[PDB]
Design a protein around this motif. Structure first.
Motif, mmCIF file in Angstrom:
data_model
loop_
_atom_site.group_PDB
_atom_site.id
_atom_site.type_symbol
_atom_site.label_atom_id
_atom_site.label_comp_id
_atom_site.label_asym_id
_atom_site.label_seq_id
_atom_site.Cartn_x
_atom_site.Cartn_y
_atom_site.Cartn_z
ATOM 1 N N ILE A 109 0.861 -1.181 0.000
ATOM 2 C CA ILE A 109 0.000 0.000 0.000
ATOM 3 C C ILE A 109 0.892 1.223 0.000
ATOM 4 C CG2 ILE A 109 -1.851 1.245 1.199
ATOM 5 C CD1 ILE A 109 -2.209 -1.493 2.705
ATOM 6 N N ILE A 110 0.613 2.160 -0.908
ATOM 7 C CA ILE A 110 1.410 3.367 -1.099
ATOM 8 C C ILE A 110 0.431 4.526 -0.975
ATOM 9 C CG2 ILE A 110 2.976 4.650 -2.654
ATOM 10 C CD1 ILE A 110 3.665 2.026 -3.946
ATOM 11 N N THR A 111 0.598 5.357 0.048
ATOM 12 C CA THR A 111 -0.403 6.394 0.298
ATOM 13 C C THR A 111 0.273 7.704 0.718
ATOM 14 O OG1 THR A 111 -2.421 6.985 1.516
ATOM 15 C CG2 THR A 111 -0.788 5.672 2.726
ATOM 16 N N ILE A 128 -0.298 -10.582 3.580
ATOM 17 C CA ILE A 128 0.824 -9.871 4.186
ATOM 18 C C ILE A 128 0.762 -8.439 3.694
ATOM 19 C CG2 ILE A 128 3.358 -9.666 4.346
ATOM 20 C CD1 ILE A 128 3.451 -12.664 3.753
ATOM 21 N N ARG A 129 0.738 -7.476 4.613
ATOM 22 C CA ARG A 129 0.526 -6.076 4.254
ATOM 23 C C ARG A 129 1.672 -5.160 4.668
ATOM 24 N NH1 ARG A 129 -3.192 -8.182 7.033
ATOM 25 N NH2 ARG A 129 -3.124 -6.649 8.713
ATOM 26 N N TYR A 130 2.311 -4.532 3.675
ATOM 27 C CA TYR A 130 3.241 -3.422 3.867
ATOM 28 C C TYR A 130 2.515 -2.133 3.529
ATOM 29 C CZ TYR A 130 7.187 -6.596 4.052
ATOM 30 O OH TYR A 130 8.057 -7.642 4.390
ATOM 31 N N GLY A 135 5.399 11.723 2.441
ATOM 32 C CA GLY A 135 5.205 13.147 2.270
ATOM 33 C C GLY A 135 4.808 13.878 3.534
ATOM 34 N N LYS A 136 4.365 15.120 3.325
ATOM 35 C CA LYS A 136 4.200 16.023 4.469
ATOM 36 C C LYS A 136 3.065 15.622 5.406
ATOM 37 C CE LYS A 136 2.378 19.748 1.717
ATOM 38 N NZ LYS A 136 3.552 19.390 0.868
ATOM 39 N N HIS A 137 2.092 14.811 4.957
ATOM 40 C CA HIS A 137 1.019 14.405 5.857
ATOM 41 C C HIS A 137 1.468 13.392 6.904
ATOM 42 C CE1 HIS A 137 -2.069 16.691 3.885
ATOM 43 N NE2 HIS A 137 -1.726 16.186 2.714
ATOM 44 N N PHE A 138 2.719 12.895 6.833
ATOM 45 C CA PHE A 138 3.250 11.916 7.777
ATOM 46 C C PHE A 138 4.523 12.434 8.448
ATOM 47 C CE2 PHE A 138 0.810 9.325 4.763
ATOM 48 C CZ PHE A 138 -0.140 8.904 5.655
ATOM 49 N N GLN A 139 4.622 13.743 8.628
ATOM 50 C CA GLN A 139 5.827 14.254 9.271
ATOM 51 C C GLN A 139 5.806 14.039 10.782
ATOM 52 O OE1 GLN A 139 6.750 18.469 8.852
ATOM 53 N NE2 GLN A 139 6.154 18.610 11.014
ATOM 54 N N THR A 140 4.639 13.959 11.413
ATOM 55 C CA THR A 140 4.585 13.760 12.856
ATOM 56 C C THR A 140 4.567 12.269 13.201
ATOM 57 O OG1 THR A 140 2.134 13.904 12.969
ATOM 58 C CG2 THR A 140 3.383 15.993 13.086
ATOM 59 N N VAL A 159 5.809 -1.092 8.193
ATOM 60 C CA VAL A 159 5.481 0.305 7.941
ATOM 61 C C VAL A 159 6.742 1.074 7.540
ATOM 62 C CG1 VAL A 159 4.609 2.412 8.895
ATOM 63 C CG2 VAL A 159 3.486 0.239 9.452
ATOM 64 N N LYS A 160 6.728 1.651 6.335
ATOM 65 C CA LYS A 160 7.822 2.508 5.879
ATOM 66 C C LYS A 160 7.306 3.934 5.769
ATOM 67 C CE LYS A 160 9.706 -1.467 4.879
ATOM 68 N NZ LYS A 160 10.748 -2.031 5.792
ATOM 69 N N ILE A 161 8.080 4.899 6.266
ATOM 70 C CA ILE A 161 7.734 6.317 6.169
ATOM 71 C C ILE A 161 8.822 7.012 5.348
ATOM 72 C CG2 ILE A 161 7.369 8.498 7.380
ATOM 73 C CD1 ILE A 161 5.177 6.244 7.789
ATOM 74 N N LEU A 162 8.431 7.661 4.271
ATOM 75 C CA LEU A 162 9.348 8.434 3.428
ATOM 76 C C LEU A 162 8.960 9.907 3.478
ATOM 77 C CD1 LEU A 162 9.444 6.188 0.241
ATOM 78 C CD2 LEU A 162 10.898 5.946 2.212
ATOM 79 N N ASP A 163 9.940 10.810 3.618
ATOM 80 C CA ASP A 163 9.549 12.214 3.738
ATOM 81 C C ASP A 163 9.255 12.866 2.393
ATOM 82 O OD1 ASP A 163 12.157 12.380 2.843
ATOM 83 O OD2 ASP A 163 12.930 13.355 4.652
#
Ligand SMILES: CN1C(=O)N(c2cc(Cl)cc(Cl)c2)C(=O)[C@]12CN(c1ccc(C(=O)O)cn1)C[C@H]2c1ccc(C#N)cc1
Ligand SMILES: [Mg+2]
Length: 182
Positions: A109-111, A128-130, A135-140, A159-163
């Motif tokens: 899932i890419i959101t 199996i879910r990744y 982006g900016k909606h996940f900065q906190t 869970v991967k977070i990319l800025d």
């Protein structure tokens, strides 16, 4: 070692054409790396509703990632992530669409946003879910933790977070070190 892998992506709030195209390049990069393996691929775009951009049967027939994603149009509406996961589980992971009953099921899932719906994903428990939050909606840290409920456990793996969308290429580089293709 059969894997049926579905990309489920929403770029409704990353309006920029360059950002959305990076999502597409990432999927292309993965499929090229895994061509002629026992992996088969499908991809679904979601916003307010859900569109199968290509299914597993289409992948086997055309097996050319550039061709499969040529006609993708950027949806610009909401972020109905619960609805989208249930769509994939009940409509895409289906043998009539080329899915293999013996295969391991993986959902990527890419959101770019927090979900705009509610519900459960009980239909997706055997998948199996990744999830990649970009982006900016996940900065906190708080916004990042809302994504854990969609992913498999532990969140430190799934869970991967990319800025920024530019960092999808670097995530691809790091994923390649975790596979060995004979
Ligand atoms: C580690 N790992 C991983 O990061 N992903 C993963 C994570 C993200 Cl965000 C995006 C993408 Cl495209 C792949 C995976 O799918 C796996 C888990 N996995 C499996 C395979 C089989 C089984 C099982 O049989 O139970 C469980 N997990 C295969 C492995 C992987 C790693 C790199 C690439 C690339 N390029 C593709 C797949
Ligand atoms: Mg969105």
């Amino acid at each position: 070692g059969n894997v049926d892998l579905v990309f489920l992506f929403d770029g409704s709030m990353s309006l920029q054409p360059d950002e959305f195209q990076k999502i597409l390049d990432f999927m292309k990069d993965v499929m090229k790396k895994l061509s002629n393996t026992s992996y088969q691929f499908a991809a679904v775009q979601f916003s307010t509703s859900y569109k199968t951009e290509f299914d597993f049967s289409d992948y086997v027939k055309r097996k050319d990632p550039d061709a499969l994603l040529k006609h993708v149009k950027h949806m610009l509406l909401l972020t109905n992530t619960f609805g989208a996961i249930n769509y994939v589980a009940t409509e895409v992971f289906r043998e009539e669409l080329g899915a293999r009953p013996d295969a391991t099921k993986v959902l990527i899932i890419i959101t770019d946003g927090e979900a705009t719906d509610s519900g459960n994903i009980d239909a997706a428990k055997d998948i199996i879910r990744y999830i990649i939050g970009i982006g900016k909606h996940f900065q906190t840290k708080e916004s990042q933790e809302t994504l854990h409920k969609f992913a498999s456990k532990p969140a430190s793996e799934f869970v991967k977070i990319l800025d920024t969308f530019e960092k999808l290429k670097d995530l691809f580089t790091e994923l390649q070190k975790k596979i060995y293709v004979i």
